[PDB]
Amino acid sequence: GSALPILLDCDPGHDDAIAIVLALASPELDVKAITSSAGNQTPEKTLRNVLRMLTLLNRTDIPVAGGAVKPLMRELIIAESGLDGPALPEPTFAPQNCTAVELMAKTLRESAEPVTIVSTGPQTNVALLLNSHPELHSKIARIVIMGGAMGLGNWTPAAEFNIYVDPEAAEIVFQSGIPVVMAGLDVTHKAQIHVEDTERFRAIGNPVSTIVAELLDFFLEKWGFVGAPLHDPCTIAWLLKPELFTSVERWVGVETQGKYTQGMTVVDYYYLTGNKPNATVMVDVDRQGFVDLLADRLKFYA
Amino acid sequence: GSALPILLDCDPGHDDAIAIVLALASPELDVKAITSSAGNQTPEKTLRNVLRMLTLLNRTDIPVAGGAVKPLMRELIIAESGLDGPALPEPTFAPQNCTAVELMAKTLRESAEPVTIVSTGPQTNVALLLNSHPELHSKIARIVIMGGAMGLGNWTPAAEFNIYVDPEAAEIVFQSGIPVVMAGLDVTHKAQIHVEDTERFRAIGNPVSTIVAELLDFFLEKWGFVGAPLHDPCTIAWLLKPELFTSVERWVGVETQGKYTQGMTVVDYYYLTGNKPNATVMVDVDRQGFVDLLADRLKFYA
Amino acid sequence: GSALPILLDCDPGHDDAIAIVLALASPELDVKAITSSAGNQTPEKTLRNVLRMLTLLNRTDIPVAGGAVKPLMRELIIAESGLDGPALPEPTFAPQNCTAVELMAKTLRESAEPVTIVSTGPQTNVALLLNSHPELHSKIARIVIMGGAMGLGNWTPAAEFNIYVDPEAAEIVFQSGIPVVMAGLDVTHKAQIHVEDTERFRAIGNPVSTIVAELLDFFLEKWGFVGAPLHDPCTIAWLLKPELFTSVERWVGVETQGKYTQGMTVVDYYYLTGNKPNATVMVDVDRQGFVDLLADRLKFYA
Amino acid sequence: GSALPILLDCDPGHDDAIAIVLALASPELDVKAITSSAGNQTPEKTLRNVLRMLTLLNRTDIPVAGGAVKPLMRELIIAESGLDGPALPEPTFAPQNCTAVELMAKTLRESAEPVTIVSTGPQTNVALLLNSHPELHSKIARIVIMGGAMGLGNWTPAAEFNIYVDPEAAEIVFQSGIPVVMAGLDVTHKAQIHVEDTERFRAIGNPVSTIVAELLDFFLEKWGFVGAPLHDPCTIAWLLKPELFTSVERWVGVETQGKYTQGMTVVDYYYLTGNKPNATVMVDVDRQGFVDLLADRLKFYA
Numbered sequence A, B, C, D: 001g002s003a004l005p006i007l008l009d010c011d012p013g014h015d016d017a018i019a020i021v022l023a024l025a026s027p028e029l030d031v032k033a034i035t036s037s038a039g040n041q042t043p044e045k046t047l048r049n050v051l052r053m054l055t056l057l058n059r060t061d062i063p064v065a066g067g068a069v070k071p072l073m074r075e076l077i078i079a080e081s082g083l084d085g086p087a088l089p090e091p092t093f094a095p096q097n098c099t100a101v102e103l104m105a106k107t108l109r110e111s112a113e114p115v116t117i118v119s120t121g122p123q124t125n126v127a128l129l130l131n132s133h134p135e136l137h138s139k140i141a142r143i144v145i146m147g148g149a150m151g152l153g154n155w156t157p158a159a160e161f162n163i164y165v166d167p168e169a170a171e172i173v174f175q176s177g178i179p180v181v182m183a184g185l186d187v188t189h190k191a192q193i194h195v196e197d198t199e200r201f202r203a204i205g206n207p208v209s210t211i212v213a214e215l216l217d218f219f220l221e222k223w224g225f226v227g228a229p230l231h232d233p234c235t236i237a238w239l240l241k242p243e244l245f246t247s248v249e250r251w252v253g254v255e256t257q258g259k260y261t262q263g264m265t266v267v268d269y270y271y272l273t274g275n276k277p278n279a280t281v282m283v284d285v286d287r288q289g290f291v292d293l294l295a296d297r298l299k300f301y302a
Ligand SMILES: OC[C@H]1O[C@@H](O)[C@H](O)[C@@H]1O
Pocket: A011, A013, A014, A015, A016, A040, A079, A120, A121, A146, A154, A160, A161, A162, A231, A232
């Protein structure tokens, strides 16, 4: 029958690109559209990068649209192409002549079943969709994000990059009443790709496994990591094999006003507030299992 | 030739309704659509009220769409129909099968010239349009709002109602780079309709002038007002006869974080900041001239 | 209140252009869109001509779309710009990024009341609308055409030009079950503009009355006419002042198969068939009254 | 990579339904939409039948739209549900809120590559698409029809049913300049399913192979057939395995005017006219190979 319908919103970005690769190697998922957010790079670059990845993967049938050019209430800060390392093809196809929100809305309207949204850059497009289309909330099964940290941030002391870029958009997502699943730094810093794992991917032997290895190569070349955290593919991996993860439901609030804490995801892990949980927070992963999943799925491109 | 194209976004609301009446009596203006915001009443009620007013005025040709159901990042607070007083007709037509933002976007796309947006409730729809359609900013001539106060607020000590309902949306408007014109309480509290003026409107003698009088009657039945301030029609009046007003260009910022000041419009009247002006702020009005304008235009419905 | 909503489909064409002028000088009518058919000239030229006329008339607010590039089942035959004579402005605006049928459909969907279609070239676009949008038939009040002849044709012995170009499309219109009103050659050959009438239009003295005179000049420079028949404006004139015309309801069939009669409108004037009437056929006009109407309306452009 | 994109337009109809089954069991094909034509049954029934088949097959992700309610220029004639025999599920999903032509156009616009149209009922929707969207012809790779007969007809002496229902639409398709491939009665009368073949399908053992057998059962219960011709699946079979067929390129004209020959496909097999070929005409099939293909593909539903 039909697969699980998903909308992927992202800002490639090496790990976003690997998330695309993993999703497209997974027949359990039906990627309905890919839209670009601005974060890792400027909106022109993230859009171009989605197109190049879909060109590489011979999935020009998936509609693409460029999203918001900046955060809701803040100027854009960025992380020279945004996908440096491998030689990638020029796009062989054009994005749709609409915005990301328009393409997401069209998908939700057209759909006969609730759609899962996966957003692995700043939450700007997702927030705009939620606020502008209250009539389509019933068509959203859940929103699976890469962003936030119960613990320390990777951009400012308290904040992870994606949330920091657009804290207001993230807060809108968490306040929306739609189930939210969060792959924060607590899980992604455990999802490390060691040099031996990149070697393993390279040894798979096909052009896509090679490109994935090259993407991983370039990024790697105080945190105390053995290998590089591979953040965005944790969202897709969780959809495919949730048994690889430990996840808890807690209340999460995004700080938008603090002097020293803008963009922090405040997670009420110990039930200190009266707040009902609004998110599933990933807190652990079987790292070898995660690597095994990526390696197995890369055989799709043989 | 063609008139000045406008998009009217509002939350009727007695003064919003009078603003509709004034706009539709003015051949210099071409009202392209009317959309409803939530503020004065719930979104179902403000939508119904737009429809009832257009039914009354025999302008069922103007497309109508309901907007956002709540503020961007806040729960809705409201000011039992929202237009109490006169007996109004049930709607004879349906709203468009799209959202307010969709209808605004379609208008801007279709337009051969920049369109003036007039927004007299909370700025929620306008902000969603600005953020979701960066490609359409060049199609927006200016945004004329009723909201804010250089001086004291009418809802909280520092904040006027429309801005207070959605401070984030108002801030997005003021930060947008599109010319903004503000009819705040500084001007609207001067735009008082005295009992003698309502008598004058009633003496015009047609069904619409009568309804306007009834709307004014009901609202009237510490501020030190002689008559009731008629806020929202100041936006339309400024478009028709700017010579009735004194306006200055200053920097305006909307407070979104303060303990005691959320929703305040902070106006740098005395050039104390380094900030370049982003708004035209109305600070005075020829009150009798404003009343004369309304009375003259009401003859349209003879 | 609101005016009579119309969709104008045409192939300018000097008389089509004069029909546009007359319609836009008439506040009783609300021209919702103008679309171009191919007939008098190629589809690129008729589209350009609509745009030039709307530019001249300062009505760039009326949306324009190009229609079908050829007849349904036949190659295009045409009557070097298609509006030769006057110097006309280059367009200052673009057509909509949709087809004529799409623009007509959007209009009908958006409308709160049945819309009158006026089609003064071949019926190609109208037929495509009727067949492709059966759900919108209830939104069409009537279809007013310029085309056909109860008597002799002006293109082949039995056929008038517009019907001859696309007989199948015309037959679809007449078979549609929507009220059809026909300004055929029986009426239009009586609607002659004499040299003295063109002088009168020229003496009105404004740039548009001058252009109309120039259009009439050029066309004029066996039929036994005193002046040139002004065909297409008879449709608009009938909407404005039906009392200027004598019209009868009869059955009309369009010949699509005959050896010698393709494109003939067969009118059962004497009730010789069992067929129920499907059209209002204009058979007479008060010519001076028609000229008076045009001259009076041209004062609009003073 | 991505599969071959197709638009399926059909009027189920037992063989149309089997064509849907075959297409959805074939990963080489990406069915972008299914639209309904009127022919075998009324338009309400063919639409319902598409929905029931997609419900059965768990492919509610494929968008569906109802098409034209009657032939272009003729009243509808039909072949009590239109899919009698098996118990089928009620639809679990709704058709799109647009017409067939609108859905086809949207698909063609959105597509990054030319799309193959397969039409197995009357050509009404396809013709409307071709005439109304000349700008999208370059997005149509080819049109594969079931219809016509080089030899004798199955509805009137000279005409096959699908062409007879709408000869004008078929003629528009053949005149369009887009490559046309025709599975006429010459091939479909050879594509017979014997009782032993239905037994074989039934022995495959899954719910879908069972339903296919039931559909074949009911239809069977002067022509000189051993088994029932299975017409519409020949189009899909030709796309999957053209080596099963013998096909020739010849000129084909559809008769629309004849006294005794309306709806005939006139095939210039012996090059007697000066006309350049406009169609690929299927003239032979490896019947056992065709049955083998259906049986192999039915294993998809195990
Ligand atoms: O902080 C993690 C995020 O930063 C970006 O660099 C990655 O794409 C990821 O989504």
